[PDB]
Write a protein that binds this ligand. Structure first.
Ligand SMILES: O=C(NC1CCCC1)N[C@@H](C(=O)NO)c1ccc(-c2cc(F)c(F)c(F)c2)cc1
Ligand SMILES: [Mg+2]
Ligand SMILES: [Mg+2]
Ligand SMILES: [Mg+2]
Ligand SMILES: [Mg+2]
Ligand SMILES: [Zn+2]
Length: 889
């Protein structure tokens, strides 16, 4: 089982200068002919020529048009093609091969595969070797000349990278297209698509060079009416890179293509971006609101890769966060600017502190630049992406916009057209840092620990105020818990964006200030502070850390009502909730453990409830923010704060807290649910796919959140509102009506009604599946069996499988049933899926990531299922590696 080590990087002894491909698609097989124009590098020491090549059927291989003979001149073991060095030329040579591959039965969706009636490739990370022989690593840059042939009736649209330079007819009903892509690229950015594709198109004129760029968005004919928003998002993405970063697209054409079967969200193949259909296609009649932000961010993400990933690429896969963390950061800047809603940034933090913090305290914890890997298909993590993005964002917080832009342009200008490493980016940021500090001795050497140190830092505070001196002190310390990657953790460069709120009038007491904490602890003193402030700490969530604000709930309430920073307001509310959750959890736990006949629960703080009401009733306050304050923190956020978490006790705790607040605020909730209707459900632009109103969607989020609270509470006659909600044209509304009807006798009536509305659109049906999966039903196990028999069946579409099972795994009371029946069910799905798609099988392991944080009975139950999966004789490399790491074997 080969382990790759970051420190072992060495340049290849070979060079591949030119790739000339002929991909001939036939009904039962695909024939790939490839000529590689190669050379000997300065690092060559006379080694064998070893190509990656996985699952290829060899028809012939040759060197300089001389056919090589198996056994004598080469060996092939279905993974590596080895040409013995005595037969390898010593100067420039041509290697050629013809192989047979089978996209029709390629259900792992890596390499060349068939998704419904579309032939499509996915080559990142090491999938190109599943198409033809190559030295499959991103520092092997080459030019590509690609011809694709296929039946014209089945595959009229042929696409690859670069310029289409010829189209030709072929006897027997076939046709061909030739694409030449002169700029050097790594092979993971190669792509090919063939299908009966329909499109929308537009022309974009770049801001400075005034180049005309042809934009094409493609789907199967059935869904061509769902392409409009994606095209709008692409234009928006191009304008943002031009306006913020001064970067223009360099090619004459950009194609985006939706396919139904895709392992992840989308892929940035040069000029030919390929998308999970659920991340490219939408219409107002057939998509929930979430689709619109999803398409915006994913289209943006792939577009921003054209510079951060494509034009500046990776030396090796250990640098993955250099392109993914930086592109997520660019994507997040873009989405924040396009949506103009504070909930966009809040939603990113909420994901980080639940999913990524859980990963970072799990046995899977790794730094954003790991030291080793076995499976590249398991390398694409929320740590690499989302903690990576926060590390990339901290440069902007440290430098400010002007110097960040200066440093970013240094990075692009110095590395355009080349591979790069994380050091190259830190170096560019350091040059800007010296400029900002006016100090050529300043350096960012300490910053590099963000790339190598795993785990979430904890930052805690103590305060002092001298009223006579008007002097305020913030004493700060940082700590990262030792883990399996570093026994000793070093202090990081932590930027702490801070404000000081005057508690008497709510006003700012100092200018914008970013404290630079570079030691294990430091004391920051402020003079001329006229009154004792309430500190507003880590504004905008300025570092990816556990914040221990050491504030009272009275102080947190004051920030929640009156602070200027949306994150600190949201975090102050989160912290009030967490204090209550931990207190009530321990009270319920003690009652369970001691088998008490009576006991007391500490009520929710009444001033906190008053503050929620105050914000809810503020007509100038933001609807999306309102929906966050009436929602308790995510379960996966809570679990980072409780040892041996009993999920039933936590479910009882949340129930008590929601009921406490509802018993006071339900009339407020109902009144708002009714008063929000007119603006939230406005149909003026329902038939304009170009008109997307993120504030209006946030109003629907608030209505649907309040409806959930009111339905669980059995608010008088709320079933009438649920039924009327089911008649709304907006899928977010009528799918909500299904979810909230779980608490009423009408659930299966609405189940059938919404099924009928959903069944004729592939993506809407998947949203329906998710809604059923997450329904708060006592009979959810029977319902899942019904979905399996009636809808899901033996589909191999990852979107179908993930829709049926993942939402259910977030059902705290039912997935964690003490019998272990939920763990048994998901383990059976994982093992079944692993037979044909190991990457998605490992995705389905997600609920097990917290196994060692649960109560000892549930730890044992989860471990038993993971050991059962590990004992499967046919377990994939992906799944075995993942479960061995997760179970500390
Ligand atoms: O969609 C995404 N979602 C993110 C969210 C948190 C982690 C993943 N990530 C994109 C991306 O970064 N696009 O730019 C992406 C991720 C993985 C692959 C990939 C890698 C492989 F080894 C394969 F075998 C394969 F089939 C696919 C392709 C694209
Ligand atoms: Mg094969
Ligand atoms: Mg413009
Ligand atoms: Mg995103
Ligand atoms: Mg299907
Ligand atoms: Zn990406």
């Amino acid at each position: 089982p080969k382990i790759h080590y970051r420190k072992d990087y060495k340049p290849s002894g070979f060079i591949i200068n030119q790739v000339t491909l002929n991909i001939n698609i036939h009904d039962q097989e695909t024939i790939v002919r490839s000529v590689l124009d190669m050379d000997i590098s300065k690092h060559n020491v006379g080694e064998d020529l070893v190509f990656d090549g996985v699952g290829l059927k060899i028809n012939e291989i040759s060197i300089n048009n001389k056919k090589l003979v198996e056994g004598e001149e080469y060996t092939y073991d279905n993974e590596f093609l080895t040409i013995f060095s005595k037969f390898v030329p010593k100067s420039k040579f041509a290697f050629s091969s013809e192989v047979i591959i089978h996209p029709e039965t390629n259900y792992a969706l890596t390499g060349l595969y068939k998704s419904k009636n579309i032939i499509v490739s996915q080559c990142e990370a090491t999938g190109f070797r599943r198409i033809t022989f190559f030295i499959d690593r991103p520092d092997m840059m080459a030019k590509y000349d690609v011809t694709v042939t296929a039946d014209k009736e089945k595959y009229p649209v042929l696409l690859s990278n670069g310029d289409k330079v010829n189209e030709f007819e072929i006897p027997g009903g076939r046709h061909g297209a030739r694409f030449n892509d002169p700029p050097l690229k790594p092979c993971y950015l190669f792509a090919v698509v063939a299908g009966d594709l329909k499109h929308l198109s537009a022309t974009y004129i770049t801001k400075y060079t005034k180049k005309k760029v042809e934009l094409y968005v493609f789907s199967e004919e059935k869904y061509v009416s769902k392409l409009q928003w994606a095209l709008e998002c692409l234009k928006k993405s191009m304008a943002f890179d031009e306006d913020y970063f001064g970067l223009e697209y360099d090619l004459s054409r950009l194609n985006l293509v939706a396919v139904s079967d895709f392992n992840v969200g989308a892929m940035e193949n040069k000029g030919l971006n390929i998308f999970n259909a659920n991340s490219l296609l939408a219409s107002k009649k057939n998509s929930i609101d979430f689709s619109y932000a999803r398409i915006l961010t994913v289209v943006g993400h792939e577009y921003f890769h054209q510079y951060t990933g494509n034009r500046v690429t990776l030396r090796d896969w250990f640098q993955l966060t250099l392109k993914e963390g930086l592109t997520v950061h660019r994507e997040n800047l873009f989405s924040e600017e396009m949506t103009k809603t504070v909930t966009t940034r809040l939603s990113h933090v909420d994901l980080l502190r639940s999913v990524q913090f859980l990963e970072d305290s799990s046995p899977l914890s790794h730094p954003i630049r790991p030291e080793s890997y076995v499976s590249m298909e398991n390398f694409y993590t929320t740590t690499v992406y989302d903690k990576g993005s926060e590390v990339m964002r901290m440069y902007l917080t440290i430098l400010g916009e002007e110097y960040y832009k200066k440093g970013f342009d240094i990075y692009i200008k110095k590395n355009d057209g080349n591979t790069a490493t994380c050091e190259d980016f830190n170096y560019a940021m350091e040059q800007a840092y010296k400029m900002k500090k006016a100090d050529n001795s300043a350096n960012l050497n300490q910053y590099l620990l963000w790339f190598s140190q795993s785990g979430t830092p904890h930052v805690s505070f103590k305060y002092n105020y001298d009223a006579e001196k008007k002097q305020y002190s913030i004493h700060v310390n940082q700590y990262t818990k030792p883990d399996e990657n570093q026994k000793e953790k070093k202090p990081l460069f932590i930027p702490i964006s801070v404000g000081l709120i005057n508690p008497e009038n709510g006003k700012e007491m100092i200018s914008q200030t970013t404290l630079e904490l570079t030691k294990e602890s430091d004391t920051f003193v402020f003079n001329n502070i006229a009154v004792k402030p309430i500190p507003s700490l880590f504004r905008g969530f300025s570092a990816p850390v556990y914040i221990e604000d050491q504030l009272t709930d009275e102080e947190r309430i004051l920030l929640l009502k009156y602070d200027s920073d949306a994150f600190v307001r949201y975090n102050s509310c989160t912290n009030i909730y967490m204090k209550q959750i931990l207190m009530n959890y321990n009270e319920f736990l003690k009652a369970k453990n001691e088998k008490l006949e009576s006991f007391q629960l500490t009520p929710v703080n009444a001033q906190f409830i008053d503050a929620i009401k105050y914000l809810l009733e503020d007509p100038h306050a933001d609807a999306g923010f309102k929906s966050y304050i009436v929602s308790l923190p995510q379960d996966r956020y809570i679990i980072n704060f409780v040892s041996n978490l009993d999920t039933d006790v936590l479910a009882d705790t949340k129930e008590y807290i929601y009921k406490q607040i509802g018993d006071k605020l339900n009339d407020v909730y109902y009144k708002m649910f009714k008063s929000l209707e007119a603006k939230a459900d406005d149909l003026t632009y329902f038939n304009d796919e170009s008109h997307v109103d993120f504030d209006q969607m946030n109003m629907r989020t608030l209505r649907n959140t309040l409806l959930s609270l009111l339905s669980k509470a059995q608010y008088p006659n709320i079933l009438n509102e649920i039924i009327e909600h089911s008649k709304s044209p907006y899928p977010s509304n009528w799918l909500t009506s299904l979810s909230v009807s779980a608490y009423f006798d009408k659930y299966f009536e609405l189940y059938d009604k919404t099924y009928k509305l959903s069944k004729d659109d592939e993506l809407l049906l998947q949203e329906w599946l998710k809604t059923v999966s997450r329904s708060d039903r006592k009979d959810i196990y029977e319902i899942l069996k019904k979905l399996e028999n009636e809808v899901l069946k033996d589909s191999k579409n990852p979107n179908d499988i993930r829709a049926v099972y993942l939402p259910f795994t977030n059902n705290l009371r039912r997935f964690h049933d003490i019998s272990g029946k939920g763990y048994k069910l998901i383990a059976e799905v994982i093992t079944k899926t692993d037979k044909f798609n190991p990457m998605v099988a490992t995705q389905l392991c997600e609920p097990f990531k917290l196994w060692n944080k649960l109560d000892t009975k549930r730890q044992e139950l989860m471990l038993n299922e993971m050991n059962t999966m590990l004992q499967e004789p046919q377990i994939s490399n992906n799944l075995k590696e993942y479960l061995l790491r997760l179970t500390n074997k």
